[model samples]
Target: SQSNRELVVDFLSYKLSQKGYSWSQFVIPMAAVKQALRLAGDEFELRYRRAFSDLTSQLHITPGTAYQSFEQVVNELFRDGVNWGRIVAFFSFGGALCVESVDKEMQVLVSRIAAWMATYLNDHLEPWIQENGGWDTFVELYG
Candidate 1:
């Protein structure tokens, strides 16, 4: 049984070696993204657009720039509060960023992206989530 932290690692493609989550490692972020969008519909777009745009404009990802820029951007994004839908949207955002990195031929930052997401998850979001009963709770409600 992979812990939620490990799932997050997979979510951001930081799989140490690696799922549904055990075998289908790719499913979580995709499924979560789809559900997150469906869960809120148009409001999702409105709510997330600013943050998405913020990341897009700010994220000139490079090996040197990625780490600090990521924490600053992500911390600001999550500075509001830990709304569940926002959390789901976060994964979507991360995946989108990863894709952009790949498109930019900056694939190396993908792992960096993954690492930062997991670090944020473990250090920042973990408490809020664990108290609420973890990702499975989110799944049960909407999965």
Candidate 2:
């Protein structure tokens, strides 16, 4: 199985690439295996677009506040603890931020956002993911 680290990046890559936001230098590192993962992230994003849309307007991230907005909402998301659904939502949330950044031409925010995503995954979510059987099990069920 691929690392959950890539799950975070790969999922966002699919979203950003589709939205036409460039995360330059990053090709889909988890292409084959991440297909399911990326799709699952897309599924969650679309499924929860309404609520995430609410969040979209809620924060309305600006280039200046992008970092602050990301921290706040991400912590708010995690306030409910790490579950499969929440993890998916996290990816959706990150994608939303990326898209919002692109829309605003805050292209620089993309890499920073991606880093925070990887940081949150590595520092926070990865442990819970591994504890609960990691992403392979996620693919087994949600894929």
Candidate 3:
């Protein structure tokens, strides 16, 4: 779990700096993320919080280089054995990033990341989600 958090925070910090941003911009986005995850489940909410908490620490430590790319991050997550929790975590991160992008008026960036999240979900996680009783069930219980 520490490794996963490391991967996420590194990627987050890298993306932030790439767009001339930093953790100062996370307050609103982070708050929105927590709110959304609250609808998902207690475990998801906890993981998201812990991941972001560690992300803040990682940002303080290195600022970047925890993850080289989004593809790499996803690949590593899959290699670590994909599960509902991690899948939810990835989507949650994407949601936070989308919120942050909107806050900065970066509409195109939001579109790009949204598309990326959708593709990843469809390609890798949808079948499992569907087999487990569809995404609606997930949302109802842990969206």
- The per-prediction tally of clashing pairs is 3, 0, 2
Q: Order the candidate numbers by lDDT, best to worst.
A: 2, 1, 3
Worst 10 residues of 2 by lDDT: 24-33
Itemize residue pairs with steric clashes in candidate 1. Answer: 19-22, 19-23, 19-24
- 72 in model 1: Cα distance from truth in Å? 1.1
Candidate 2 lDDT at 93 equals: 86
- Name the candidate that leads on lDDT: 2
Task: Show the lowest summed lDDT stretch of 10 residues, model 3.
Answer: 56-65
lDDT of 3 by residue, 97-125 (tens): 54455555654554455445556666677
For model 1, residues 27-125, the per-residue Cα lDDT tens digits are 565467444334433345456555376676677676677566777777666778787776767665776676666667676776667667777767777
Model 3 misplaced regions, further than 4 Å: 1-38, 41-47, 50-68, 99-107
Q: Model 3's lDDT to the true fold? A: 0.50
lDDT of 2 by residue, 1-143 (tens): 23655666777778878876676734233354477667777677576656477666777766566555666778777886888888778888888877787777777776677777787777778789889986667767675
Q: For model 1, where is the 10-residue window of minimal lDDT?
A: 15-24
Global Cα lDDT for candidate 2:
0.72
Write down the lDDT that model 1 would get: 0.60
Q: Order the candidate numbers by TM-score, best to worst.
A: 2, 1, 3
